[PDB]
Design an enzyme around this catalytic site. Structure first.
Site, PDB file in Angstrom:
ATOM      1  N   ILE A  71      32.661  35.728  47.997  1.00 64.03           N
ATOM      2  CA  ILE A  71      31.762  35.355  49.231  1.00 64.03           C
ATOM      3  C   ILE A  71      30.292  35.164  48.821  1.00 64.03           C
ATOM      4  O   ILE A  71      29.813  36.413  48.253  1.00 64.03           O
ATOM      5  CB  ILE A  71      31.830  36.213  50.600  1.00 64.03           C
ATOM      6  CG1 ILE A  71      33.442  35.847  50.746  1.00 64.03           C
ATOM      7  CG2 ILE A  71      30.985  35.635  51.625  1.00 64.03           C
ATOM      8  CD1 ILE A  71      33.821  36.715  52.259  1.00 64.03           C
ATOM      9  N   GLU A 160      40.487  39.314  49.495  1.00 65.67           N
ATOM     10  CA  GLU A 160      41.383  40.505  48.923  1.00 65.67           C
ATOM     11  C   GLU A 160      42.775  39.996  49.336  1.00 65.67           C
ATOM     12  O   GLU A 160      43.720  40.246  48.805  1.00 65.67           O
ATOM     13  CB  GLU A 160      41.176  41.760  49.395  1.00 65.67           C
ATOM     14  CG  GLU A 160      39.733  42.181  48.960  1.00 65.67           C
ATOM     15  CD  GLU A 160      39.453  42.450  47.344  1.00 65.67           C
ATOM     16  OE1 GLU A 160      40.195  42.006  46.732  1.00 65.67           O
ATOM     17  OE2 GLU A 160      38.362  42.902  47.092  1.00 65.67           O
ATOM     18  N   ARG A 163      44.093  37.385  47.168  1.00 63.28           N
ATOM     19  CA  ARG A 163      44.454  37.845  45.927  1.00 63.28           C
ATOM     20  C   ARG A 163      45.724  38.663  45.880  1.00 63.28           C
ATOM     21  O   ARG A 163      46.321  38.618  44.833  1.00 63.28           O
ATOM     22  CB  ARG A 163      42.997  38.736  45.377  1.00 63.28           C
ATOM     23  CG  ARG A 163      41.996  37.977  45.126  1.00 63.28           C
ATOM     24  CD  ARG A 163      40.740  38.860  45.024  1.00 63.28           C
ATOM     25  NE  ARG A 163      39.517  38.253  44.857  1.00 63.28           N
ATOM     26  CZ  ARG A 163      38.461  38.834  44.885  1.00 63.28           C
ATOM     27  NH1 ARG A 163      38.238  39.918  45.567  1.00 63.28           N
ATOM     28  NH2 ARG A 163      37.203  38.321  44.539  1.00 63.28           N
TER      29      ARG A 163
HETATM   30  C1  M7G Z   1      30.857  41.608  41.115  1.00 60.53           C
HETATM   31  N1  M7G Z   1      30.999  41.130  42.278  1.00 60.53           N
HETATM   32  C2  M7G Z   1      32.424  41.475  42.839  1.00 60.53           C
HETATM   33  N2  M7G Z   1      32.219  40.879  44.199  1.00 60.53           N
HETATM   34  C3  M7G Z   1      33.438  40.770  44.871  1.00 60.53           C
HETATM   35  O1  M7G Z   1      32.977  41.204  46.097  1.00 60.53           O
HETATM   36  C4  M7G Z   1      33.604  42.110  46.403  1.00 60.53           C
HETATM   37  C5  M7G Z   1      33.168  43.544  46.333  1.00 60.53           C
HETATM   38  O2  M7G Z   1      32.453  43.586  44.994  1.00 60.53           O
HETATM   39  P1  M7G Z   1      32.529  44.760  44.091  1.00 60.53           P
HETATM   40  O3  M7G Z   1      32.160  45.957  44.515  1.00 60.53           O
HETATM   41  O4  M7G Z   1      31.833  44.035  42.850  1.00 60.53           O
HETATM   42  O5  M7G Z   1      34.001  44.509  43.700  1.00 60.53           O
HETATM   43  P2  M7G Z   1      35.274  45.298  42.905  1.00 60.53           P
HETATM   44  O6  M7G Z   1      34.488  46.478  42.467  1.00 60.53           O
HETATM   45  O7  M7G Z   1      36.472  45.476  43.784  1.00 60.53           O
HETATM   46  O8  M7G Z   1      35.503  44.513  41.777  1.00 60.53           O
HETATM   47  C6  M7G Z   1      35.266  41.955  46.041  1.00 60.53           C
HETATM   48  O9  M7G Z   1      35.900  41.152  46.409  1.00 60.53           O
HETATM   49  C7  M7G Z   1      34.618  41.542  44.449  1.00 60.53           C
HETATM   50  O10 M7G Z   1      35.391  40.802  44.095  1.00 60.53           O
HETATM   51  C8  M7G Z   1      31.142  40.097  44.353  1.00 60.53           C
HETATM   52  N3  M7G Z   1      30.795  39.297  45.297  1.00 60.53           N
HETATM   53  C9  M7G Z   1      29.557  38.797  45.220  1.00 60.53           C
HETATM   54  N4  M7G Z   1      29.268  38.362  46.513  1.00 60.53           N
HETATM   55  N5  M7G Z   1      28.771  38.964  44.383  1.00 60.53           N
HETATM   56  C10 M7G Z   1      29.120  39.741  43.183  1.00 60.53           C
HETATM   57  O11 M7G Z   1      28.207  39.989  42.290  1.00 60.53           O
HETATM   58  C11 M7G Z   1      30.425  40.418  43.042  1.00 60.53           C
END
Ligand code: M7G
Ligand code: NAG
Length: 246
Positions: A71, A160, A163
Site C-alpha cells: 500500500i 496479506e 498473498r
Molecule cells: C519493505 N516494505 C514491505 N512493505 C509491506 O508493508 C507491510 C509491512 O512492511 P514490512 O515490515 O517491510 O513487511 P515484512 O517484514 O512483513 O516484509 C507488508 O505487507 C510488507 O509487504 C512495505 N510497504 C510500504 N508501503 N513500503 C515499504 O517500503 C514496504
C-alpha cells in the site's frame, strides 16, 4: 480497480474481493503454478486502486503497487495520504492528483515503524471484517496515531490475505468478530519475501529451497519449509514477489 463493501459483507463477498484483488495484479509467468508478480511496471499502471466502503457507505480509495502489493497511500474525500518513503512519494506523482491537499504520514509503511506509531505490535491488534470497517472509518479523518493502527488492519486484511489463502481464511473466520492474528498469520506475513525468493530459486534446483524458510504452523509449532511440496507452496501462497525486487 477493485472494490469491497462492508455493508452486507460476509465470508463469500470478502472472498470475491480478495479473488478480484489477486486477479488485478498482472503476471506473465507462474512459478510452481503461482503467479509471479512483475519486476516492474511503468507509469500509472504500476498502481491498483481499491475502493473500500465502510458499513455506512463512506469510502477511501487505496493505491497499491501491483509489483509487490505494497500500500502506498489512500484518498479520503479530498485529502490524499502517503507513506513517508520514496516509493510512495513516486506514487503520489501518479494517483489522487485531483486531491485538494496531500498529507505525508509521519512514518513509512514498514510493520515495525507502523507498530511503534500505533503503540502496539500487531500481535495485539484484532483483525477481521469489523476491524476493517473501523479502519476505513478512522482513515476518513486524519489522526496519525489512530491511522497507524488502522493501516496495520488494512494491510493484513487486503494485501496479506491476497498473498496467502490461509490469511484470507483467517479473516473470513473473523467476518463478525475480530480477533488478534494467529502466530501462523504473523509468521506468513513476515516470510513472504523469503518464501517468494525460495520458490523462484527452487525452479533450477529440483524444487528444493536453497535456504529453508522457518514458519509457525496452525498449532503454534515452528516448522522448516525446505521444498515446493510443502502445503505452504502447493496450497497457501498465491502471489510471488519477483526476486528482482528482493
Ligand atoms: C519493505 N516494505 C514491505 N512493505 C509491506 O508493508 C507491510 C509491512 O512492511 P514490512 O515490515 O517491510 O513487511 P515484512 O517484514 O512483513 O516484509 C507488508 O505487507 C510488507 O509487504 C512495505 N510497504 C510500504 N508501503 N513500503 C515499504 O517500503 C514496504
Ligand atoms: C520436502 O518437504 C516435505 C515437507 O513438506 C518433506 O516431507 C520432505 O521430507 C522434504 N524433502 C526434502 C528433500 O527437502
Amino acid at each position: 480497480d477493485v472494490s469491497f463493501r462492508l455493508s452486507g459483507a460476509d465470508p463469500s463477498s470478502y472472498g470475491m474481493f480478495i479473488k478480484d484483488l489477486r486477479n488485478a495484479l498482472p503476471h506473465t509467468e507462474k512459478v510452481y503454478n503461482i503467479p509471479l508478480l512483475l519486476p516492474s511496471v511503468s507509469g500509472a499502471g504500476r498502481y491498483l486502486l481499491m475502493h473500500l466502503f465502510n458499513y455506512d457507505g463512506n469510502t477511501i480509495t487505496v493505491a497499491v503497487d501491483v509489483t509487490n502489493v505494497y500500500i502506498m497511500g489512500y484518498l479520503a474525500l479530498t485529502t490524499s495520504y502517503f507513506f513517508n518513503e520514496p516509493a510512495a512519494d513516486l506514487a503520489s506523482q501518479y494517483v489522487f492528483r485531483s486531491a485538494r491537499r496531500k498529507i505525508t504520514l509521519p512514518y513509512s509503511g514498514n510493520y515495525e515503524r507502523l507498530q511503534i506509531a500505533a503503540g502496539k505490535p500487531r500481535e495485539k491488534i484484532p483483525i477481521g471484517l469489523p476491524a476493517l470497517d473501523t479502519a476505513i472509518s478512522t482513515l476518513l479523518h486524519y489522526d496519525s496515531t489512530a491511522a497507524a493502527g488502522a493501516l496495520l488492519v488494512l494491510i493484513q486484511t487486503t494485501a496479506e490475505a491476497a498473498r496467502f489463502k490461509y490469511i484470507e481464511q483467517q479473516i473470513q473466520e473473523r467476518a463478525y468478530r475480530d480477533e488478534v492474528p494467529s502466530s501462523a498469520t504473523i509468521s506468513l506475513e513476515n516470510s513472504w519475501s523469503g518464501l517468494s525468493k525460495q520458490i523462484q530459486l527452487a525452479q533450477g534446483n529440483n524444487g528444493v529451497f536453497r535456504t529453508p524458510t522457518v514458519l509457525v504452523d496452525s498449532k503454534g509449532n515452528r516448522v522448516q519449509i525446505t521444498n515446493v511440496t510443502s502445503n505452504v507452496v502447493t496450497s497457501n501462497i498465491q502471489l510471488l514477489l519477483n526476486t528482482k525486487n528482493i
